[PDB]
Amino acid sequence: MATVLTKGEIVLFALRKFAIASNASLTDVEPQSIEDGVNDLEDMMSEWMINPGDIGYAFATGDEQPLPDDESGLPRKYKHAVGYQLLLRMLSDYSLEPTPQVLSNAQRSYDALMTDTLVVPSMRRRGDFPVGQGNKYDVFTSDRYYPGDL
C-alpha cells in the first residue's frame, strides 16, 4: 500500500495520542515500552481472529520475536481503529484513565472498521420446499424441490 505500516508505527501512534512519548508535548521515549507495546499488539491481533474476524494481519512465522520494524500487512484504512483499541488496552500500564473524547473517537473508529466487514448471511430455501410447475422442473431444469444444501 501507500507507505506500508510497520508494527512500530502503530505503537508509536498510540503512545503519542495520549501524550506519553512525543515531540509535541514535552520530550522522550523508552525502549521497554516498545517491546511491551508490540507484544500487546500481537496478542490483540491473535484475539481478533474470533470476534471482529481476520483483517489481514501478518503474524510472525515460526517463533522468533515480532520486532517493531516488521511489516504489519494492514491497509492504511485501519490504523486509527487498531491504534485506539491498543491504546485502550495499554493505558493501565502507566496508571491512567481515558477521557470521554478518547472513548468517543475509539468507538467511532471501531464502528468504521465494523462497517467494512459485514456479511448478512442471507438464509436459503429448505430442501423439502417444492418448486412450482411454473418453472418447468421436467425439461428446462431438473430436481423439483430445492436442493437447499450444497
Binding site: 412450482g132 410447475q133 411454473g134 418453472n135 418447468k136 428446462f140 431444469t141
Partner: protein, 51 residues
C-alpha cells in the same frame, strides 16, 4: 413468366408478406391465450428462469 418461370413466385411471396403484416399482433394474443390455458407450465411463460 409462370410455372417454371418464377416471376409468379415473387408475386406470391410479396402477397404472403402483405397478408401477414396486419394480422400479426392479433394472432399473438390467440396463441398466448391457448398456451396460457392448456400448456402445463404456460401461465408463467416470460419469467420461467428468474431469481
Amino acid at each position: 413468366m409462370a410455372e417454371t418461370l418464377e416471376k409468379k413466385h415473387e408475386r406470391i411471396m410479396l402477397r404472403f408478406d402483405r397478408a401477414y403484416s396486419p394480422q400479426k399482433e392479433v394472432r399473438e394474443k390467440c396463441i398466448e391465450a391457448t398456451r396460457f390455458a392448456r400448456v402445463p407450465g404456460g401461465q408463467w411463460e416470460g419469467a420461467t428462469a428468474a431469481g
